[PDB]
Amino acid sequence: PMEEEEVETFAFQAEIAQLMSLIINTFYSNKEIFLRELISNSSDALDKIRYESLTDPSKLDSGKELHINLIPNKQDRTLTIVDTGIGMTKADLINNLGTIAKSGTKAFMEALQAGADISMIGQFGVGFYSAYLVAEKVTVITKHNDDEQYAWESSAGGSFTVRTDTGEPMGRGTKVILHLKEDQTEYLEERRIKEIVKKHSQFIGYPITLFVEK
Numbered sequence: 001p002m003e004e005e006e007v008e009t010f011a012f013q014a015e016i017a018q019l020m021s022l023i024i025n026t027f028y029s030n031k032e033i034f035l036r037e038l039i040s041n042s043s044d045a046l047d048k049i050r051y052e053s054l055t056d057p058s059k060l061d062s063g064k065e066l067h068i069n070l071i072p073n074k075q076d077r078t079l080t081i082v083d084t085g086i087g088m089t090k091a092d093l094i095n096n097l098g099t100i101a102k103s104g105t106k107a108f109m110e111a112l113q114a115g116a117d118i119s120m121i122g123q124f125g126v127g128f129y130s131a132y133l134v135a136e137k138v139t140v141i142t143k144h145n146d147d148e149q150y151a152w153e154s155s156a157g158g159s160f161t162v163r164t165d166t167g168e169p170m171g172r173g174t175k176v177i178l179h180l181k182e183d184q185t186e187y188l189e190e191r192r193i194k195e196i197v198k199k200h201s202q203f204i205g206y207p208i209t210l211f212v213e214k
């Protein structure tokens with residue numbers, strides 16, 4: 001039907017849709033780097049809210065805790081990365097994030113078509129899109145102090161959606177929910193997540209807590 005006035009559909013910027021298709025279809029085995037890139041993004045988000053609060057302590061009224069949580073769910077086949085950083089506004093989700101990423105995306109594609117491999121995506125500032133190395137659908141729940149709670153979602157293919165979230169309020173931060181591909185379930189294992197974290201994302205300025213399944 002798609003007669004839901006609460007859900008809006010947008011097309012990715014041409015360069016970004018291209019990058020996503022390239023990431024999805026390239027044969028690349030070193031997929032674990034996706035978790036490092038997302039943990040780096042959360043650390044950046046937490047640095048920003050911590051820095052803003054030095055001049056305005058009321059920015060932490062929405063939560064003093066500053067941490068990162070990793071939550072595998074074997075039943076739903078999802079790996080969720082939660083942080084209490086600055087969050088994202090509606091403008092960020094629709095306009096600003098893609099605009100700021102245009103230049104880095106183009107450059108990254110040149111590097112790839114030259115020699116560089118996918119693991120350097122973070123050097124171009126577009127590491128988030130490495131999530132689709134392992135995820136067929138990505139759902140992002142976010143809350144910025146200056147806006148409402150929103151839900152961003154995309155299964156690639158050139159389009160993404162944005163709606164006002166109706167679920168549990170978070171207070172402030174971001175939840176990245178990775179709906180994992182059938183053959184990428186190794187990233188729901190506790191020993192595997194530990195290895196990847198200790199490898200790269202290890203000197204992070206905030207506590208990283210792994211939720212073990214029951």
Ligand SMILES: COc1c(C)cnc(Cn2cnc3c(Cl)nc(N)nc32)c1C
Pocket residue numbers: 041042045083085086087088093097128140152174176
């Ligand atoms: C909506 O999904 C994203 C898109 C399409 C592009 N980049 C980022 C990374 N990213 C940007 N700001 C972010 C903040 Cl405040 N936090 C986190 N954890 N990631 C962020 C995200 C999450």
Ligand SMILES: [Mg+2]
Pocket residue numbers: 020021024156157158
């Ligand atoms: Mg595609």
Ligand SMILES: [Mg+2]
Pocket residue numbers: 067069209
């Ligand atoms: Mg906690």
